[PDB]
Amino acid sequence: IQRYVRKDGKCNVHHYRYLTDIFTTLVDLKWRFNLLIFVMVYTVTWLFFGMIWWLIAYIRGCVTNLNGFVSAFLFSIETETTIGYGYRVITDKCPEGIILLLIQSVLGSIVNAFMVGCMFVKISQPKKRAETLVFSTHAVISMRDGKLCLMFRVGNLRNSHIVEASIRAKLIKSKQTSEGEFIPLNQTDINVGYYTGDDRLFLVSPLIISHEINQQSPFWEISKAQLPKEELEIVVILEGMVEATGMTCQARSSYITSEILWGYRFTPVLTLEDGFYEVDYNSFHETYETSTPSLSAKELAELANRAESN
Amino acid sequence: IQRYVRKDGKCNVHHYRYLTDIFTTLVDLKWRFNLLIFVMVYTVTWLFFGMIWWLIAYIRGCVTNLNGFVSAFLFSIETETTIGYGYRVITDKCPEGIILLLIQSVLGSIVNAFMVGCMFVKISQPKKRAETLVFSTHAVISMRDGKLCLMFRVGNLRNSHIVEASIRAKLIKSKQTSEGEFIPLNQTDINVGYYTGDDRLFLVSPLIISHEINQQSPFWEISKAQLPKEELEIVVILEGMVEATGMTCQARSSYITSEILWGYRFTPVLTLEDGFYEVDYNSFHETYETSTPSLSAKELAELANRAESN
Amino acid sequence: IQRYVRKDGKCNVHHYRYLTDIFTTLVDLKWRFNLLIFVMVYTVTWLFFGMIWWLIAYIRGCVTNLNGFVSAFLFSIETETTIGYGYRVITDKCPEGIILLLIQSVLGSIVNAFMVGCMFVKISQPKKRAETLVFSTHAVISMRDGKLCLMFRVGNLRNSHIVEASIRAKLIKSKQTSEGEFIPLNQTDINVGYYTGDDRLFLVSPLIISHEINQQSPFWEISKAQLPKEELEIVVILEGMVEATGMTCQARSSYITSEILWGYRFTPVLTLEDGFYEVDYNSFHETYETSTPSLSAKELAELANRAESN
Amino acid sequence: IQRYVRKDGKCNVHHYRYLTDIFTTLVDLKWRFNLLIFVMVYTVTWLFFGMIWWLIAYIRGCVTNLNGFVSAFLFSIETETTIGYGYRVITDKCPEGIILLLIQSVLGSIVNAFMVGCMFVKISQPKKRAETLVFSTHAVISMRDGKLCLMFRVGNLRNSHIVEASIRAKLIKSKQTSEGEFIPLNQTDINVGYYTGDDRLFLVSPLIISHEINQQSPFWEISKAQLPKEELEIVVILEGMVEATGMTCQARSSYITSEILWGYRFTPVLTLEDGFYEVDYNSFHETYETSTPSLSAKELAELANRAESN
Ligand SMILES: [K+]
Ligand SMILES: [K+]
Ligand SMILES: [K+]
Ligand SMILES: [K+]
Ligand SMILES: [K+]
């Protein structure tokens, strides 16, 4: 079976109450659609009012300088667009015209107010900054001061902060319960700092996120040899608020069994030049292999505790 | 007595400082109300200014092409709606007219700015996306790798994420204190992942939320037999931010004693077809019963610890 | 010395970089101020451009139907307010006029866009909903299933939720360190659910917040008799997001030594009528006294542990 | 090597997918840029439409009172700015003109709606309130009721709250792993209240943040004498939401080895005058030295435990 989350963040799952917010069905779409639909609803109000204008216009013979429905449209414009050329002006004789304008004048400033709002949000869409946050292309497993770690690397490309940025990881893997319940893409959390507040990053330059593999880690029992065989996939989530706007964004990625590398280790990406720190974004995804025991974290521990014991 | 929260999210409780924010009294209402009140306040400003316009107009005899108060309204329009037909134009002779326009011109662009804002928020109301988040219709109680669990199922229907989505549960049940204090619909939290960060979901496909029933669970003492008799109600809360807009939404639901099912178990809703995961939303609320001890979680434990002991 | 926070939420403390956000100096003010300043800056742009218009107008003799600076103002209006009467129209002969309009036309739609924004936020100010959240007028201390508690009561008046609502408390009291450092209004946290997630409320009807007084509570050593003498003040903070808008609000209050009541107990405010829960907001602040040991929580404990011991 | 974060908050690090949000590349810039670019895109639409207007205008000979491209611009204005002088009015004879206006009329109210939005956010930028939050200029190390502390001081200058304000600290220092991995500006968290909820401030007057130096602190092994030699830098982060708007802001600062002062102690900044608390912001950064053991926190402890032991 094939992966839940694509390396780039989109998921591999497809799914009446979408009119309960006819708002959000709009915001997901793409530009040329909106631009036309904007016009669609803009165009139609001019038909709608232009028909109703001609409805009370035909009854009359409130109207100056018109000939057909070609003029009911261009009058409907001088109104809603509040252009008002003053060639086709309003006149007093009839008691019907004013209160239609009043219907329109308000409604035309409603159609605008509705649709400055949606434009704004479309522009301001947070998910866009999900582009300028990046993950390393592989995760690695290797030793760090005695304990075995699973490490992936995280980055922010834009010169400005993404405030309140945290991270979490989820292990996805089907399992069976002693009882017999199969649970298809079951999700359990991976400790990446939660308990100390170390998962609350400070993302000014690329950081290495490190999950230590201990009795509670999923990778406790997994040795180098077993790893390739294992059918797990690690989902990785960076969440934070765009300094620029309070908008709260999220960046996902994924590691599948074959993208975790046993015994390797990230290239450093930092150096100092004339007062600024230099990120060599070339070295970002790069890793190298070092000497790394091949045993599971568990077997590795016992070999330690037998040493201290003797 | 009858339930606190309706399966759909509204609560069964009814309640001077509502003018301390005359803002929020507006936003709760329904469309046809606003649409009229918008017009109400729109219409009245044209009366108000039109009266005041005629006030200084009568004194004059700043005014061109008017006859009655029929013209003070249509002039009041060419101003506020900034239409300005140029049939009824301003003129210099009087020192009074300009500074009224200046009162209006600003105020007309105030009445707009006020009421693009409220339109926007009404459109953008987060609570709307509370529709596209769903809970299972029943909760169940059954075994999962040895420990007894209370499980309900949670979903997101819309193809897009609801960011930073967490969950919590509250047990509502009246109680008495040794002391004698009766406490009517008293609320205590149910562990659904809080301590590990497992309550911080990743809601891409329906998940099963599971509260393990241990010494600290409310359901420690409750056996299958006792359950029907118990007068509890579990309130369930999903909170998160709409990816689309930073708006922070909340979805509630409820389980009452008779909607928890002992010994059952959710149907899986997942399958893989040609590269996409298939949610069979038909199987969403569906459960089946499996073999499940009928004892309380407590009695079930002791029977275990007596086994290990011997 | 006198209290830090007034029962109503304002604090009793008074305080170059206020132009680093000339934004927020604006939003704190009151309506009549804005309304005038709006006009102030609106009025002045018409002077400013009207002077500059007459500057290039005098040079000319781009201009139709003007006499003095009375017309440079009313032309400056038909421009910025985009009214454009078409009595005073633009003309081609001069190469200077168009690019000033272009300066203005853009700037007039800037002055608007600037000041729809601030209007909006002023309207939408979250702190307003700090009015519809209420605290009980007193806190009490009395027993709850064996342990001694400090309890105050919290409410939401508006029929709609305030999402993600939590609570915290701070103990304020000057102290001295063995070392000798005096620390004037020093602040330490009071446990009101933090460790279990019980401080994350569900505020649909008034709840009683309860801090159990244990070895870690500030009130461990304080007996009934000592209480009046103690110079402490408890600050109470309710934080949450307005369901209506993502705006994140905060409601404070305070308890000083003499407003905590030993041995009392809140009146219940709940009852059920024909399917709706009835909050008797009359009974909201009301308490009564019950039988309550007068000893400190500490002395009360030891008397227990000596009992179990024997 | 030189510091990661400047005392004022900017970092000392410099860094295709910046068009994936051409939104945020805009908001970082400075006023005079926007003001011109606004005009840039405003000016060009009048060229663009004015050319296209003349395109179908030349074909004609929909047009009244024009001479060259000087009029195609001033007509393009009476349209987009919705000024509509009514000297140059629309006419019926041609079937081409109306649907271009309809292209424009909508697009002109799009260019506006786009660029009220960005104006707004630029105005409302949260990072601005990062100016009115301040840190003390030095941190100090000295005793507080027996335990050794690292303390820095934090403030809010503006009379209004910054809601939900928390604090965290990061220790930055390169290190080597037994294994051999060098890790250049490696980041580990410093406890400043996280575990008790004491890092969740109530910032009404300047507070002293205190990290107790215990077995888990980085400063466990560091004595007064060693301190100057150590190459560490403490990064300090205040995060919270502007009461005024939900915008979520962040304020950083930094302490390098030589800005931590062993044996000193902050001057109190509080006093009471006629009912208001007086902050003497003069005493804000000020410290004095007191009698302070010079040993590391570790050696200091053992000397204690040897005392209790005997
Ligand atoms: K914690
Ligand atoms: K927000
Ligand atoms: K107009
Ligand atoms: K106009
Ligand atoms: K006009």
Ligand SMILES: [K+]
């Ligand atoms: K925790």
Ligand SMILES: [K+]
């Ligand atoms: K916790």
Ligand SMILES: [K+]
């Ligand atoms: K006109």
Ligand SMILES: [K+]
């Ligand atoms: K905690």
